[PDB]
Write a protein that holds these residues in place. Structure first.
Motif, PDB file in Angstrom:
ATOM      1  N   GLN A   1       0.807  -1.210   0.000  1.00  0.00           N
ATOM      2  CA  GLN A   1       0.000   0.000   0.000  1.00  0.00           C
ATOM      3  C   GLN A   1       0.842   1.263   0.000  1.00  0.00           C
ATOM      4  N   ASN A   2       2.098   1.179   0.428  1.00  0.00           N
ATOM      5  CA  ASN A   2       2.986   2.329   0.486  1.00  0.00           C
ATOM      6  C   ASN A   2       3.921   2.408  -0.714  1.00  0.00           C
ATOM      7  N   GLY A   3       3.828   1.469  -1.652  1.00  0.00           N
ATOM      8  CA  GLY A   3       4.562   1.556  -2.897  1.00  0.00           C
ATOM      9  C   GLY A   3       5.780   0.665  -3.059  1.00  0.00           C
ATOM     10  N   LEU A   4       5.935  -0.347  -2.208  1.00  0.00           N
ATOM     11  CA  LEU A   4       7.092  -1.229  -2.250  1.00  0.00           C
ATOM     12  C   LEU A   4       6.649  -2.673  -2.108  1.00  0.00           C
ATOM     13  N   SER A   5       7.595  -3.580  -2.291  1.00  0.00           N
ATOM     14  CA  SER A   5       7.429  -4.977  -1.931  1.00  0.00           C
ATOM     15  C   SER A   5       8.104  -5.220  -0.591  1.00  0.00           C
ATOM     16  N   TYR A   6       7.849  -6.389  -0.011  1.00  0.00           N
ATOM     17  CA  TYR A   6       8.467  -6.717   1.269  1.00  0.00           C
ATOM     18  C   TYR A   6       9.986  -6.701   1.169  1.00  0.00           C
ATOM     19  N   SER A   7      10.526  -7.310   0.116  1.00  0.00           N
ATOM     20  CA  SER A   7      11.970  -7.425  -0.036  1.00  0.00           C
ATOM     21  C   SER A   7      12.645  -6.065   0.013  1.00  0.00           C
ATOM     22  N   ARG A   8      12.142  -5.113  -0.764  1.00  0.00           N
ATOM     23  CA  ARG A   8      12.758  -3.803  -0.839  1.00  0.00           C
ATOM     24  C   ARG A   8      12.565  -2.984   0.425  1.00  0.00           C
ATOM     25  N   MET A   9      11.444  -3.135   1.124  1.00  0.00           N
ATOM     26  CA  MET A   9      11.298  -2.427   2.389  1.00  0.00           C
ATOM     27  C   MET A   9      12.240  -2.975   3.455  1.00  0.00           C
ATOM     28  N   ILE A  10      12.414  -4.294   3.513  1.00  0.00           N
ATOM     29  CA  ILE A  10      13.323  -4.858   4.501  1.00  0.00           C
ATOM     30  C   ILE A  10      14.763  -4.482   4.186  1.00  0.00           C
ATOM     31  N   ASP A  11      15.149  -4.547   2.910  1.00  0.00           N
ATOM     32  CA  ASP A  11      16.475  -4.092   2.507  1.00  0.00           C
ATOM     33  C   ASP A  11      16.692  -2.621   2.837  1.00  0.00           C
ATOM     34  N   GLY A  12      15.716  -1.768   2.523  1.00  0.00           N
ATOM     35  CA  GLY A  12      15.877  -0.349   2.778  1.00  0.00           C
ATOM     36  C   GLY A  12      15.978  -0.023   4.252  1.00  0.00           C
ATOM     37  N   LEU A  13      15.168  -0.678   5.081  1.00  0.00           N
ATOM     38  CA  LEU A  13      15.286  -0.468   6.514  1.00  0.00           C
ATOM     39  C   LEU A  13      16.616  -0.959   7.060  1.00  0.00           C
ATOM     40  N   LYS A  14      17.165  -2.047   6.519  1.00  0.00           N
ATOM     41  CA  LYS A  14      18.492  -2.467   6.953  1.00  0.00           C
ATOM     42  C   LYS A  14      19.578  -1.504   6.494  1.00  0.00           C
ATOM     43  N   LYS A  15      19.364  -0.795   5.385  1.00  0.00           N
ATOM     44  CA  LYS A  15      20.319   0.214   4.941  1.00  0.00           C
ATOM     45  C   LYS A  15      20.171   1.548   5.662  1.00  0.00           C
ATOM     46  N   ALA A  16      19.103   1.748   6.422  1.00  0.00           N
ATOM     47  CA  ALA A  16      18.930   2.957   7.212  1.00  0.00           C
ATOM     48  C   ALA A  16      19.208   2.738   8.689  1.00  0.00           C
ATOM     49  N   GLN A  17      19.744   1.573   9.057  1.00  0.00           N
ATOM     50  CA  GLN A  17      20.146   1.245  10.427  1.00  0.00           C
ATOM     51  C   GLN A  17      18.956   1.167  11.378  1.00  0.00           C
ATOM     52  N   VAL A  18      17.782   0.852  10.853  1.00  0.00           N
ATOM     53  CA  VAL A  18      16.593   0.606  11.657  1.00  0.00           C
ATOM     54  C   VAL A  18      16.573  -0.872  12.007  1.00  0.00           C
TER      55      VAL A  18
END
Ligand code: MG
Ligand code: MG
Ligand code: MG
Ligand code: MG
Ligand code: MG
Ligand code: MG
Ligand code: MG
Ligand code: MG
Ligand code: MG
Ligand code: MG
Ligand code: MG
Ligand code: MG
Ligand code: MG
Ligand code: MG
Ligand code: MG
Ligand code: MG
Lengths: 109, 142, 103, 54, 117
Positions: free
Chosen positions: E70-87
RNA sequence: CUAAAACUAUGUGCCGAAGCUGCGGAUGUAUACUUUGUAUACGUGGUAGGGGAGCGUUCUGUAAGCCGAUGAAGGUGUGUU
RNA sequence: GGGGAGUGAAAUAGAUCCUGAAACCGCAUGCAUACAAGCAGUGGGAGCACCUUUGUGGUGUGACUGCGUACCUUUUGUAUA
């Protein structure tokens, strides 16, 4: 208050008597007496004996009125069997159990 | 804290109409089944039907690629000693387009009481008109 | 007020006044502990997300006591191999109650 | 010829679910006032305004 | 010293049958059957202690997928992006926020997107 | 399922075990100092089989003691270790 | 055969008579169950009913759902038909 009558040692099996006991469970006493009066089953005689006894106990020892009474409780339990022997063909012998029952009636307003 | 399940009494199914003119069959069926099961909702619970209603119109305009219109076979068995029965895709689509979607979508769902209850929310019509105008369906561009 | 805290190798989403069980702690029943490694704070369309920690956020809590969970029974068996084994287990926990969330 | 497994007490009671008895047709002969089996002579010999064996 | 096996045997059978309440037929009445039923229940419970942790993580991942799409991503890319933002929020809490607070989850998805770009 | 949801080549992510890491607990062996108490380290799937440590049962002494009609043993529930 | 009365400390101590277990068989109350396929559980989990407190409690039932072919023996090897 329920008034009880017991008929212990009837010479019939409980499975045969439970059919007649299911017919009068929860009915008015006069209607149940009619059902038992016009039955061709043998268990009807014993069940009518126990029901008549319960009505007499309710009216004599407890001094209740009869047109208000009901067959509130009734159930049949098993009694002790008689063990007999039946000769079969070629020398074999089978065991015959002659079964018994206990009828319990509870009449109440 | 713990993970909560969706309550069936709080679930709200919605109504959508999807047009099937010029569309690959299975690539539409996967979307329909995903909506019927409720995977697009954040309250998705595998033992609860939190899905949505779908209306398919123009069911006789659905497409297949390759040579499947003549070569894809549908089978049935009547349970009599030789009762295997065979038909085409193209004979079955001009004569009973509801069963093509029935089979294609029901094969992509679970197989049990909840799967039987999900397939009930799909309504397939051959023409351009449906009777559920009182339910106010939305145009879902799948 | 919905903060996110770490404890016992797991993460919890807490509010004020909440009572929760975590893994056993060394602290004393009646003392006061403070989590100052906070991961997120939400105060209503105001959302602080830690990377990996929100800087000046505090969560204070009180130690109500320590206890055990209900008994679990472990059973190992190998069919046709003459091998059976049984064991019991009760896991320890510390019960906290959340007093304040700073943000 | 014979069973391979004994019958559960539930499948034995399911077969007996047709074993119940019914009542008969009884009416009130207000010529005499008694209860009697419909279409039958009463216990003392009365039927539809006639008496057998007076 | 003649020892009778009446009380202890009776108590053991009784304890085994008290753990079989709710089972069907001979499984709650007959000691031979109820004993196998209790042993198999213990084996099942040992294996399902391990399987519960897999089932719950699968449910969290599915709810996070529904929320991220609903926010414009897939699970894979959101998990990758959060790991790249140190969350380092874990999946049990992310699924909670997806199921109960849509605004904070949109904030998390925006943070992940920003990390990816 | 057809510019694939096939095949070949390359790349970026993710899922995935009782493996590994985190947190809590038990236990074997050896070591270090008290001099018997905890740390440290390595280990802890098992048939035949070998080794070690225990529970409960009947009976004898302790016992002419201690508990028991203000209710023993036994039976039947509940709670807890 | 029983129901009152009466005896007795006690009568579900009433002669098949101390205690009175289990298999097995009834009656009553609560919940579930007549579009759904398999060792009957286990991990979840809605609803209802009754207790209770102002519960993130207790008891009973269990719609729907993931996983899952009894035990012993003998065998290279058994859900094994
Ligand atoms: Mg002869
Ligand atoms: Mg029955
Ligand atoms: Mg990974
Ligand atoms: Mg794992
Ligand atoms: Mg390991
Ligand atoms: Mg450890
Ligand atoms: Mg070992
Ligand atoms: Mg190992
Ligand atoms: Mg008594
Ligand atoms: Mg006795
Ligand atoms: Mg139904
Ligand atoms: Mg079947
Ligand atoms: Mg052989
Ligand atoms: Mg062989
Ligand atoms: Mg095998
Ligand atoms: Mg067979």
């Amino acid at each position: 208050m329920e008034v009880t009558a017991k008929l212990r040692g009837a010479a019939i099996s409980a499975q045969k008597a439970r059919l007649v006991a299911d017919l009068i469970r929860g009915k008015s006493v006069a209607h149940a007496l009619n059902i038992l009066n016009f039955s061709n089953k043998k268990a009807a005689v014993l069940v009518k004996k126990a029901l008549e006894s319960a009505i007499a106990n309710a009216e004599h020892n407890n001094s209740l009125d009869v047109d208000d009474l009901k067959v509130s409780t009734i159930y049949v339990d098993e009694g002790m069997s008689l063990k007999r022997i039946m000769p079969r063909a070629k020398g074999r012998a089978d065991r015959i159990t002659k079964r018994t029952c206990h009828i319990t009636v509870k009449v109440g307003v | 804290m713990k993970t909560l399940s969706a309550k069936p009494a709080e679930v709200q199914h919605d109504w959508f109409v999807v047009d099937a003119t010029g569309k690959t069959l299975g690539r539409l069926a996967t979307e329909i089944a995903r909506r019927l099961r409720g995977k697009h909702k954040t309250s998705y619970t595998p033992h609860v039907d939190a899905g949505d209603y779908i209306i398919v119109i123009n069911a006789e305009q659905v497409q297949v690629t390759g040579n499947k219109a003549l070569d894809k076979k549908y089978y049935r068995h009547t349970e009599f000693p030789g009762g295997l029965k065979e038909t085409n895709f193209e004979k079955l689509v001009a004569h009973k387009p509801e069963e093509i979607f029935e089979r294609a979508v029901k094969g992509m769902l679970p197989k049990g009481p909840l799967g039987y209850a999900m397939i009930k929310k799909m309504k397939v019509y051959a023409g351009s008109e449906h009777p559920h105008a009182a339910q106010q369906p939305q145009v879902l561009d799948i | 007020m919905y903060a996110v805290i770490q404890s016992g190798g797991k993460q919890h989403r807490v509010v004020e006044g909440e009572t929760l069980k975590v893994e056993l702690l060394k602290a004393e029943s009646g003392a006061t502990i403070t989590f100052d490694d906070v991961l997120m704070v939400v105060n209503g369309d105001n959302i602080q997300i830690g990377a990996p920690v929100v800087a000046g956020a505090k969560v204070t809590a009180e130690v109500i006591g320590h206890g055990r969970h209900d008994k679990i029974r472990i059973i190992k068996m190998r069919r046709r191999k003459h091998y059976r084994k049984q064991q019991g287990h009760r896991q320890w926990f510390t019960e906290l109650k959340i007093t304040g969330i700073s943000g | 010829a014979v069973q391979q497994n004994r019958k559960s007490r539930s499948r034995r009671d399911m077969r007996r679910s047709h074993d119940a008895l019914t009542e008969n047709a009884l009416t009130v002969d207000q010529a005499t006032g008694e209860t009697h089996r419909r279409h039958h002579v009463t216990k003392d010999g009365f039927y539809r305004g006639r008496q057998l064996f007076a | 010293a003649r020892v009778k096996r009446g009380v202890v045997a009776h108590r053991r059978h009784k304890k085994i049958l008290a753990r079989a309440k709710g089972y069907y037929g001979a499984r709650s009445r007959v000691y031979r059957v109820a004993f196998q039923a209790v042993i198999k229940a213990g084996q099942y419970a040992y294996r399902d202690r391990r399987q519960k942790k897999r089932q719950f993580r699968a449910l969290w991942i599915a709810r996070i997928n529904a929320g991220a799409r609903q926010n414009g991503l897939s699970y894979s890319r959101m998990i990758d992006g959060l790991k790249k933002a140190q969350v380092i929020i874990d999946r049990r809490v992310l699924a909670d926020i997806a199921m109960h607070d849509a605004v904070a989850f949109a904030a998390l998805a925006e943070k992940a997107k920003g990390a990816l770009a």
